[PDB]
Amino acid sequence: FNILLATDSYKVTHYKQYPPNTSKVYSYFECREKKYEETVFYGLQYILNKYLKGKVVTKEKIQEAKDVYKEHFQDDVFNEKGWNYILEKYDGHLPIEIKAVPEGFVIPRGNVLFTVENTDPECYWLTNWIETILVQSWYPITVATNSREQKKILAKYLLETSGNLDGLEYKLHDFGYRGVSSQETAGIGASAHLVNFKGTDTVAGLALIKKYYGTKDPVPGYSVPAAEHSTITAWGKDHEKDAFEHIVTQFSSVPVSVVSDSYDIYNACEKIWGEDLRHLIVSRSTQAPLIIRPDSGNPLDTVLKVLEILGKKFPVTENSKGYKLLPPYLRVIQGDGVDINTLQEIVEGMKQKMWSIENIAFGSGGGLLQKLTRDLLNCSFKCSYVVTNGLGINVFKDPVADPNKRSKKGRLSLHRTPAGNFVTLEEGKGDLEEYGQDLLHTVFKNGKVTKSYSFDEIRKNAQLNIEL
Amino acid sequence: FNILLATDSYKVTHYKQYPPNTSKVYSYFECREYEETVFYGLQYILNKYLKGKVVTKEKIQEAKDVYKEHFQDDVFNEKGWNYILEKYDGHLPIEIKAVPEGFVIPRGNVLFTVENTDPECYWLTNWIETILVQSWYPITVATNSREQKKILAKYLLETSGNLDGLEYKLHDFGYRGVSSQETAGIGASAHLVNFKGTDTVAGLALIKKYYGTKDPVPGYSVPAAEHSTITAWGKDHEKDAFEHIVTQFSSVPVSVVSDSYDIYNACEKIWGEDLRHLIVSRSTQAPLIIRPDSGNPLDTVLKVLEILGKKFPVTENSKGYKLLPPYLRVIQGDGVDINTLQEIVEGMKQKMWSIENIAFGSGGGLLQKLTRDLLNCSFKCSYVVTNGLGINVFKDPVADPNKRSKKGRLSLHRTPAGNFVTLEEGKGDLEEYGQDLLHTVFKNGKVTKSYSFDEIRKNAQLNIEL
Numbered sequence A: 001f002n003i004l005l006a007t008d009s010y011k012v013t014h015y016k017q018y019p020p021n022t023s024k025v026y027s028y029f030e031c032r033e034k035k036y037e038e039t040v041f042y043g044l045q046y047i048l049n050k051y052l053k054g055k056v057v058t059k060e061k062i063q064e065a066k067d068v069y070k071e072h073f074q075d076d077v078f079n080e081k082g083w084n085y086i087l088e089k090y091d092g093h094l095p096i097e098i099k100a101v102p103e104g105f106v107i108p109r110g111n112v113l114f115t116v117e118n119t120d121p122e123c124y125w126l127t128n129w130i131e132t133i134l135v136q137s138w139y140p141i142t143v144a145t146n147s148r149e150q151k152k153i154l155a156k157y158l159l160e161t162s163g164n165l166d167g168l169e170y171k172l173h174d175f176g177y178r179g180v181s182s183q184e185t186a187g188i189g190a191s192a193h194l195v196n197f198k199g200t201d202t203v204a205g206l207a208l209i210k211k212y213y214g215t216k217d218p219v220p221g222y223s224v225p226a227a228e229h230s231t232i233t234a235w236g237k238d239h240e241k242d243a244f245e246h247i248v249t250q251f252s253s254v255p256v257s258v259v260s261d262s263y264d265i266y267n268a269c270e271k272i273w274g275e276d277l278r279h280l281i282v283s284r285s286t287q288a289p290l291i292i293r294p295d296s297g298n299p300l301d302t303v304l305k306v307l308e309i310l311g312k313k314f315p316v317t318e319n320s321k322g323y324k325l326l327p328p329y330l331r332v333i334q335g336d337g338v339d340i341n342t343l344q345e346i347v348e349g350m351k352q353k354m355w356s357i358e359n360i361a362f363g364s365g366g367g368l369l370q371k372l373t374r375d376l377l378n379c380s381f382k383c384s385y386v387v388t389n390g391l392g393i394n395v396f397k398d399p400v401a402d403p404n405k406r407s408k409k410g411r412l413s414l415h416r417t418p419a420g421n422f423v424t425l426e427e428g429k430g431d432l433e434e435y436g437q438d439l440l441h442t443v444f445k446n447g448k449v450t451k452s453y454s455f456d457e458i459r460k461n462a463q464l465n466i467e468l
Numbered sequence B: 001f002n003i004l005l006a007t008d009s010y011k012v013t014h015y016k017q018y019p020p021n022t023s024k025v026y027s028y029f030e031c032r033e034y035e036e037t038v039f040y041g042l043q044y045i046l047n048k049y050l051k052g053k054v055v056t057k058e059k060i061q062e063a064k065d066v067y068k069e070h071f072q073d074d075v076f077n078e079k080g081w082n083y084i085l086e087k088y089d090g091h092l093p094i095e096i097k098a099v100p101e102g103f104v105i106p107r108g109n110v111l112f113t114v115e116n117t118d119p120e121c122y123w124l125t126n127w128i129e130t131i132l133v134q135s136w137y138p139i140t141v142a143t144n145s146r147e148q149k150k151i152l153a154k155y156l157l158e159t160s161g162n163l164d165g166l167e168y169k170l171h172d173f174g175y176r177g178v179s180s181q182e183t184a185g186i187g188a189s190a191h192l193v194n195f196k197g198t199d200t201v202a203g204l205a206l207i208k209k210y211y212g213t214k215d216p217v218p219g220y221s222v223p224a225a226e227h228s229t230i231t232a233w234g235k236d237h238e239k240d241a242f243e244h245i246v247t248q249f250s251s252v253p254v255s256v257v258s259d260s261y262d263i264y265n266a267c268e269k270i271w272g273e274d275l276r277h278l279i280v281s282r283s284t285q286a287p288l289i290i291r292p293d294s295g296n297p298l299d300t301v302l303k304v305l306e307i308l309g310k311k312f313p314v315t316e317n318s319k320g321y322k323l324l325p326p327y328l329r330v331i332q333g334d335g336v337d338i339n340t341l342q343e344i345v346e347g348m349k350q351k352m353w354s355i356e357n358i359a360f361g362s363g364g365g366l367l368q369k370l371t372r373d374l375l376n377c378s379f380k381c382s383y384v385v386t387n388g389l390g391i392n393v394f395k396d397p398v399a400d401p402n403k404r405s406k407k408g409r410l411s412l413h414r415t416p417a418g419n420f421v422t423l424e425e426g427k428g429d430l431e432e433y434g435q436d437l438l439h440t441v442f443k444n445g446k447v448t449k450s451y452s453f454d455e456i457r458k459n460a461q462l463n464i465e466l
């Protein structure tokens, strides 16, 4: 990886555009106000460690960048002297200070999350060079936030239909490995989901957490044996029952998920599980349920009909809240068409039909890890303060046609209000000490990571109020 | 990277689930029934992740240790992975056949097939589904970028009478707006199949390493301002910022974001009056490109053109459309996706503005606002051999006929009328439809056929270009 080639092309030309005698450029990241009222701050530590810390500049990396940019711009605009200064003066360590809110912190929209400034006047251009790399923090923030918003929905309906939150942390499983844009995205997004939940098939998340964050536990996430269409259909259309019997016999003493919609989900539930193989299900341990997996049709209609079928073939109980409960050897996972909108529709539809949320778990792939943009929380990096000719200037944009794109002015700090909420103070007003100490911590300075969070601390920070 | 840790967790358990006496699992990828897709990106995945010695003793032990904790159970196929290590020096006993990269193929056609070449590794075909299915992303970026090229080509031809500058009309602004550094490189490279303009530098190194071009680089950019380089001058000094930037870049094209405070003021009073002398003096090879970046994308473009048309000498081209002087152009780089791009060029045509006047920048719309569901990219088992007998295999869910999968051994053919057909159930072997367009690209740990980026661009050309 070469940080000289890890920026938007136009940033190569910016050192020539700032006012002459600029010694400081100070910038900040926020999830701008435009429901998603609060965001989980997660993922900066990965970026600091993988891309920004240590000797990130070499003679070879400067020459490679110079040669690429000569052809890319058909011109010599690359700041070879600027990058040589960092190599010679700081042994290729970035003279940058980053201050950040602690990872896992849940912060309302429109608040400073991190700030970036140069620590050497010669490197005024370096602050916004690394905008592109740092702004990619939008992705883990947005995955972690969207995953937590789904946990809030599941927690509300599980508490209402069961009276407790038992099994909440296994109710939204990451199915998204095949449905993301790259191996690197898979690791980052799966790790962001595991801030809120413990169930993942995106194995890439485990190694990222272990290398960059750390857990007391051997692994941060768990899975179970499960079928796919290929392991059912390989037996032939007329032998679906033989596939089912083989798979539940192979996994007789652990939980096993079996996709049941290869030909006819309703037939599979009522005739194959419900009659032909019923003797192999009712014998199973509470620690080894069969989880029936529909994977096609209208998500709500399919879940309700599957539960109606299973409710007639298996002994249903009524829990202490008056909701119906399958026997403990039998559960359902809906792994198709799940996003934050359909998840809400399904748990509401189950509640209206008196089915406990105890009965169901969700799998989400594209909806969880891919169907998200930087526009969802309006993640944005802007210059708010410069020093030119030794004089500090509060700087901002304020486009006439979009007040939502107005940026904050001057040196920023994050504070608790007297009522215990968050406020971002602008124009250096944090210095007045009317709001106590700045909640941002220096996490990066002059090529070193200076403060860091375990994955266990991030999980505690990101807990729901209902969990607390 | 450890390929034993690069699958969906459940695939770790599938070797126990296949019918006993299964010697072959044969699987295919299609974009299930955006009427045609650009096949691009498989060669990246083959080289980066699948080729050479991908299994070691250390990688087997590491997978075993992770899976023991992940499943709280010993289900990992240590024996199967150790067999590949000892028998084949850790080279995957897999054969992949693929349509050539850059080929534009209608929906619902086989694009590549995967099968095991050793009966012991029946389980390996679908192990690598997860890695291979990520080809959805470069296919979808390349396809969506090409569909935007079709819209731009149509309106440029109608309003100008030619396609000059088409290849610079959709610029990649997406580096900050994608999920990772790796996604940036793959997505940017997929866009460059169709266009030559990118700020996503990561695409250049990917193309050089995995595909190659005759030209030094596949993609180009221009000096351009950002809000930081304008706003740093202070609110009262926007004119000083513009003057400094166009003077620093007097001899090359320069893009200047003009909406920091008031885009309409900047166009009419700063560019249009105060600094007009620095603009009308510029070369045809060194235009000012004014960049709005806020408000309604269509309304803002139309009002910016109306303003510039009243301050600068406009001509009428041979098609009757209004053309700014050659030293002055516009780039709309905010809120651009395939839907709004169409709205903007249609709105310009109705107001008699040539598409010659404008280029588009697209970030999230181009590289991030896409899913595997857009072209229904999907990998399914179509054929197995069990007890030495070949069986046609498929799914056909009662509640969704759109998820019905193809049966048996597949081949891709030209029809008599020059279209495409996928033959099922091994009917390619009858040879009624000429040569299979699938070629072996990977066999037993070796990439057997490669394409240059130059070949891929040729294959993905528009009809209007031909």
Ligand SMILES: COc1ccc(CN(CC[C@@]2(C(C)C)CCOC(C)(C)C2)C(=O)c2ccco2)cc1
Pocket: A167, A170, A171, A173, A199, A222, A223, A224, A226, A255, A257, A286, A287, A288, A289, A291, A331, A332, A333, A358, A359, A360, A361
């Ligand atoms: C990938 O497929 C999945 C994933 C998660 C679930 C939810 N699970 C399994 C939970 C456990 C882990 C290892 C996933 C943890 C708690 O107790 C156990 C039952 C012993 C195992 C369920 O039992 C379930 C499904 C629907 C409602 O409840 C079901 C299927």
Ligand SMILES: COc1ccc(CN(CC[C@@]2(C(C)C)CCOC(C)(C)C2)C(=O)c2ccco2)cc1
Pocket: B165, B168, B169, B171, B197, B220, B221, B222, B224, B253, B255, B284, B285, B286, B287, B289, B329, B330, B331, B356, B357, B358, B359
């Ligand atoms: C990133 O900002 C951009 C990118 C591309 C454009 C389009 N360009 C510049 C094209 C060239 C660049 C991309 C190397 C190639 C052709 O010849 C030149 C005019 C000399 C230069 C334009 O001139 C333009 C904008 C709107 C309509 O036309 C404009 C702004």
Ligand SMILES: NC(=O)c1cccnc1
Pocket: A174, A175, A176, A201, A226, A227, A257, A293, A335, A363, A365, B008, B010
């Ligand atoms: N474990 C599963 O059922 C699963 C995993 C990934 C994608 N689809 C389903």
Ligand SMILES: NC(=O)c1cccnc1
Pocket: A008, A010, B172, B173, B174, B199, B224, B225, B255, B291, B333, B361, B363
């Ligand atoms: N060159 C540009 O104007 C640009 C690049 C990346 C993102 N936004 C704008």
Ligand SMILES: [Cl-]
Pocket: A227, A228, A229, A259
């Ligand atoms: Cl599946």
Ligand SMILES: [Cl-]
Pocket: B055, B056, B057, B058
């Ligand atoms: Cl080895």
Ligand SMILES: [Cl-]
Pocket: B225, B226, B227, B257
């Ligand atoms: Cl910008």
